[PDB]
Amino acid sequence: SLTWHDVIGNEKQQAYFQQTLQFVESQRQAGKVIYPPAKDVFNAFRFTEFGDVKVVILGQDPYHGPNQAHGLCFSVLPGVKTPPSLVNIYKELAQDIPGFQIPPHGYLQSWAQQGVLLLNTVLTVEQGMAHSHANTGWETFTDRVIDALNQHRNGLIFLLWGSHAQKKGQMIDRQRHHVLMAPHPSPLSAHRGFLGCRHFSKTNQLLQAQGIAPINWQPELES
Ligand SMILES: [Cl-]
């Protein structure tokens, strides 16, 4: 029943956090193209409340091209070309989940509505520049996010894809929470151990073992 407000609202008063927001705003004011739009930065928290989190998936940076990032890792809004990482996520789901169909869009917010926290560890990026906002304080913030989930929840499933995400989750209590590892679904590593990981069926097995409803991984468009 605890909310993000309850467990991490205190971050608003932290110097590092205020300095992160001040930096992003100054960059925007200077004419830097920063993604996602300001109104979307915290969408993962909007769409999966703290007490509602069942599954945590980490990304690193928001997508850095136009029309892509909207505040959820890996997702793009309807009408946008499915980026390479999500192409591979979808390929895995098609093999892993009976009856899953690769959708003609990349919008994953229906996963968030079911309790899948779609968290990037860095929450903004300058256009075309990977890792541009890596050392701005966002990693501090998302460290606090992961610590809150680790300490104040039990039985979460963390899907940690790639070395950055796995290092990010190094403090997660692996007895109290269920951590699943695979490489990043980017084409740079998908074919070297992500494809075949079966994380989506495994996640559902673990949820069912707890008496929790499994995720319907088939993404839905707005109605
Ligand atoms: Cl990608």
Curated annotation (Swiss-Prot):
Cell location: Cytoplasm
EC number in record: 3.2.2.27
Organism whose genome encodes this protein: Vibrio cholerae serotype O1 (strain ATCC 39315 / El Tor Inaba N16961)
InterPro entries given in the database record: UDG_fam1, Ura-DNA_Glyclase_AS, Uracil-DNA_glycosylase-like, Uracil-DNA_glycosylase-like_sf
Keywords: Cytoplasm, DNA damage, DNA repair, Hydrolase
Active site: D61 (proton acceptor)
Main function: Excises uracil residues from the DNA which can arise as a result of misincorporation of dUMP residues by DNA polymerase or due to deamination of cytosine.
Domain of life: Bacteria
Primary localization: cytoplasm
GO cellular component: a single term: cytoplasm
Protein's UniProt name: Uracil-DNA glycosylase
Bridged cysteine pairs (disulfide): none
Gene3D superfamilies: Uracil-DNA glycosylase-like domain
NCBIfam families: PRK05254.1-1, PRK05254.1-2, PRK05254.1-4, PRK05254.1-5, ung
One of the GO biological process terms: base-excision repair, AP site formation via deaminated base removal
One example GO MF annotation: uracil DNA N-glycosylase activity
Similarity-based family: Belongs to the uracil-DNA glycosylase (UDG) superfamily. UNG family.
Catalytic reactions of this protein: Hydrolyzes single-stranded DNA or mismatched double-stranded DNA and polynucleotides, releasing free uracil
